[PDB]
Every structure is written in C-alpha cells, then in structure tokens.
Design a protein around this ligand. Structure first.
Ligand SMILES: *[C@@H]1O[C@H](CO)[C@@H](O)[C@H](O)[C@H]1NC(C)=O
Lengths: 214, 214, 112
C-alpha cells in the first residue's frame, strides 16, 4: 500500500527554522509530483507547496513564498519542506500528499504538528473539579501546558462511559488549558474512587489527580 | 486565486437521508477540475470523488458529484453512519490549489437540553493566585448555546473561554465548557458566582451559581 | 476553464505505430509545458510517456517521440500491438509562466 509518513514536527521559536520530511513507500515515488498541505488547529486545509517528480518545477502558496522551499530526494523516497522565518500563523498540522496522475491529491500522510510559539515546553498543573436529579459531574482542569497534545483518561481507562475531554484552548499567556469531565451516578460518589490520568508526552509528565467530593 | 466557498457550514441530517453539499467558485471551474475530500476528527483527510464522474478507490457509489462553472454539489444519496464527517471541495485545474472551508455533516437528533454544573476553583489553584471557575453544559443538542457569567449579578465580558466537544458517537449530543478566569484578588472581592445558560431546549434560562466558601 | 482536444479514434499502423496531434488552449500564453500520455485500463491509469519541453525547443523524451508546432503536439508512439486497443488520454500541464494549468483530453482511441 501507498503510505506517507511525515517526521520532524515539533516546537519552534518565531523567526527560526524547521525541516519536515515525508517518507514515501508503496509506489514509484520517482514517478509522482508531491505536495505539502497544512491545517491550522480548528481550521481548514491550505495548500502550501508543489514539487515535480524531478524537482525542476516548484510552486508556493503566497503566504509562504520566500520562506519555505520544497525539495525531494528520490534515492531516499523522501520529500522535504524547509521552513524558514516561521510565524505563529504557520502553526498547523503539516500533511504530505501525492499528486494523483489525474488531478487530485489521492494519498495523504497522517500529518505532523508544527507549533510556532515563544513558549517553552511545560507540563500541566491539574486541579480537581469537585462535585457538589441524581447525576453528579466531576472533572480535572488540565491547565497551563505547552505544547499540544495532552491525553486524559479516567481511573486508568476503566472509566470511559460519560467522559468528555474538551479541545484545548490557547490562553493569553501562550499556554494551553483544557478540562476533562465525567458524569457519574450521584450515589457512587461516596463509594467509587475517581482519578484522572493526565499525560503530556512533550514534557514526560504523567499526573494522577483524585477528585473527591465536598 | 480561484476562491472556493462552501455551504452550509453544518448540514444536519439523519442516517438514510440524502445530503447535498455545495461548493462555489469565484471563477468558472471545469466540471472535471473539482475534487472532494472527507475528514474525520484527528485523521488525515482522504479523497472521495474527483473529475466529472470519477471516484477514488474504495469510495462507494452513494458518493457522486455534479455542477458546472460556478456552483458544484456533492450528493450522498443515502447517508451511512460512517459518512458523518467534514467535507472539503478543491479545484485542481490551476494554481494555487485551493480548498473550500469545509462542510460538517452532523447527525440531526431530537432536542436535548443541557445539564448544567458549575465548579468553583480548587483550593490548590487558588493558592497559586489564579481562580478558574468552570461551567459545564453537558450532552445537549443542537450545538448552539449561550453561556453568560454573572459575578455578584454583574455580567462579565472578555474573561471567559468556551470549548465544545465533537458530536458524541452514541447519543449525538455536544458538550460545552465555559471557563471564567480571574485573579485570586478579584475572585475574593466578590461572593456570588453564577453561570447563565440559554438553549433551545430550555423554556427559561437556567442559572447555576455558588457562594464563595461552601 | 482549459481546453484539450484530441482525435476521438485513430487507426494504428501495420508495424505498431500510432500518431495524432493533441491540441491545447488556455487563458495564458505558456512557454514551458509538460505533455503526458496516459492509458485508461478500464478504471486505472498508466503513464505511457511524458515530456517537459519549452516552446520552440525539442520535445525530448523511450517508446514515444514528439514535435510541437505552437500548441499542437504531434505525438508519435511506436511498438503498440493489437493488445493495446484502449483509451489514451492527453494530459497537458502549463508550467511557466505562472500559474500552472491542468487540462485533460476527453480521450483518444487506438486500434491495432
Ligand atoms: C505527425 O507526424 C507523422 C510522423 O511523425 C507525420 O507523418 C504526420 O503527417 C504528422 N501529422 C501532423 C498533423 O503533424
């Protein structure tokens, strides 16, 4: 099968560089023109750049003209995106995409996250959202972490029914914040133990917070 | 650039019904120059149909496209569960390659009013000089809801952030969290914290409040 | 849009040589084009040959050769057997000056 695999995503300081690479396999990479397409968090797909099979023809979206250069290595089945002078608005998931011989982008890698921000990687503080007609709600406020993502499970994954982990929001400060909540039979509060398991891979922080009632 | 514009933002249908999504070009695009992509949350988009009659590998024949010049449409003749997703059109006849801004196909279900819960800041968090007050609107439909914050019965402006979950895969509802963030000093100046919810399923607006120190 | 026109049906040679002119028209006046031959294998696609050339210059490819005079490419394909009776699509890509343009022919049909 055709498979595309992007690497090199991570956190960048504004104005600095980053080089993504896309590892192609399952087709004659030499035979296809390739593209990068990106997706800013919450938003749509924006085409970034085009490279012909032999590297002679390139095209760039005006928003990256002059700052990005595309390249490929055919001996390595690898497509490259060299990003210079990055800005906050270049924050997105960067997909690598094959130009199908009939027009469209027929195969997409699963993307790599690129966060342009002056913030420095920081794990979250985790505060309890404590419970007070017989449903109760309780949760964990997962606050002030960078970069995305973060994963939240409850009771080591035993608790999935009822759970809502919200999309992060980006605060004034440059740090992300999110809550994960779960609804639960009010009677179970004084008999069941509730711990949210918060995992922020970028900083190697795993936090467990027990959420107790009043 | 050929600017592509989609309609509606969200299409609300029940399984088995027929979905017609629209794509509009700022210029005259050839019928065989348009492509449609499907995207599900957290996944790369994939190609459905393209050209005048062509269809990507493994896409079923309930997916089909039409239109000339300025106004294109994607028809899903009978919606399956796996077809509730976001759809993007794209023209590929000239450069730059441009995408529509996406149409969400959401499951329409009966109206469900939210259950509302308000969480005061943790003792832990207060110690650190910030107070986060969280209001949760849980498992409601449709998506449009209005949360207002009253501090000592005085509406707040500019000091909240909202965040909405993807539509639930089982009960087809949404959940919204509105977080009100104050300093420790402002939070301890006032007494009554109240969250005021307006929704289609509520005869009256629902107010959940607490008194600081309980 | 963009227009590409190619004969509806051609009759190949007794030695396996099929030829015809492919014609393109566009809003621009491009100086670097890539003409690509494809074979339609019922529902899949095969790159038969392709050549990025510039106006005036040689159309340099292979089992294909070419000459362009203006916006007409005299496409020559040698060595096609009776088993190649299928649809051959003409793909034209205008590379420079910007913007890029894609045109795809309604199809041409070869008999051997
Ligand atoms: C195209 O080329 C063939 C041989 O290469 C020639 O015999 C034929 O007359 C040419 N036709 C046109 C229309 O240029």
């Amino acid at each position: 099968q055709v498979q595309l695999v992007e690497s090199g995503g991570g956190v960048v300081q504004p104005g600095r560089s980053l080089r993504l690479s896309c590892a192609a396999s399952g087709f004659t990479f030499s035979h296809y023109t390739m593209h990068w397409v990106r997706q800013a968090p919450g938003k749509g797909l924006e085409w970034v750049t085009f490279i012909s099979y032999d590297g002679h023809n390139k095209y760039y979206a005006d928003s990256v003209k002059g700052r990005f250069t595309i390249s490929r290595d055919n001996s390595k089945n690898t497509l490259y995106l060299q990003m210079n002078s990055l800005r906050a608005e270049d924050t997105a998931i960067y997909y690598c995409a094959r130009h199908g011989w009939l027009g469209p982008f027929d195969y997409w890698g699963q993307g790599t996250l690129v966060t342009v921000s002056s913030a420095s990687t920081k794990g979250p503080s985790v505060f309890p959202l404590a419970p007070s007609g017989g449903t109760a709600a309780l949760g964990c406020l997962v606050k002030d972490y960078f970069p995305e993502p973060v994963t939240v499970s409850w009771n080591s994954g035993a608790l999935t029914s009822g759970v809502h982990t919200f999309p992060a929001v980006l605060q004034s400060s440059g740090l992300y914040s999110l809550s994960s909540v779960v609804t639960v039979p009010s009677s179970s509060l004084g008999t069941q133990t509730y711990i949210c398991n918060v995992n922020h891979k970028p900083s190697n922080t795993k936090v467990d917070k027990r959420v107790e009632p009043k | 650039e050929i600017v592509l514009t989609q309609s509606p933002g969200t299409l609300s249908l029940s399984p088995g019904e027929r979905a017609t999504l629209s794509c509009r070009a700022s210029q005259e695009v050839g019928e065989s120059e348009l492509a449609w992509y499907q995207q599900k949350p957290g996944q790369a988009p994939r190609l459905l149909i393209y050209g005048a009659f062509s269809r990507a590998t493994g896409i079923p024949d309930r997916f089909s496209g039409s239109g000339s010049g300025t106004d294109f449409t994607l028809t899903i003749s009978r919606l399956e569960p796996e077809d509730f997703a976001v759809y993007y059109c794209q023209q590929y006849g000239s450069s730059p390659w441009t995408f529509g801004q996406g149409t969400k196909v959401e499951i329409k279900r009966t109206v469900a009013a939210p259950s509302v819960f308000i969480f005061p800041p943790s003792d832990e968090q207060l110690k650190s000089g910030t107070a986060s007050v969280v209001c949760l609107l849980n498992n409601f439909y449709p998506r449009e809801a209005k949360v207002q914050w009253k501090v000592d019965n005085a509406l707040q402006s500019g000091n909240s952030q909202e965040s909405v979950t993807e539509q639930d895969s089982k009960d087809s509802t949404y959940s919204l969290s509105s977080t009100l963030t104050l300093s420790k000093a402002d939070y301890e100046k006032h007494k009554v914290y109240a969250c005021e919810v307006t929704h289609q399923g509520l005869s009256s607006p629902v107010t959940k409040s607490f008194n600081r120190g309980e | 849009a963009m227009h590409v026109a190619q004969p509806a049906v051609v009759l190949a040679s007794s030695r396996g040589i099929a030829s015809f002119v492919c014609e393109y028209a566009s809003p621009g006046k491009a100086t670097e084009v890539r003409v690509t031959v494809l074979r339609q294998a019922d529902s899949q696609v095969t790159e038969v040959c392709a050549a990025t050339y510039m106006m005036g210059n040689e159309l340099t490819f292979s089992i294909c050769t070419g000459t362009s005079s203006g916006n007409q490419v005299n496409l020559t394909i040698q060595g096609l057997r009776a088993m190649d009776t299928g649809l051959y699509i003409c793909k034209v890509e205008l590379m420079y000056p910007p913007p890029y343009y894609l045109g795809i022919g309604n199809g041409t049909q070869i008999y051997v």
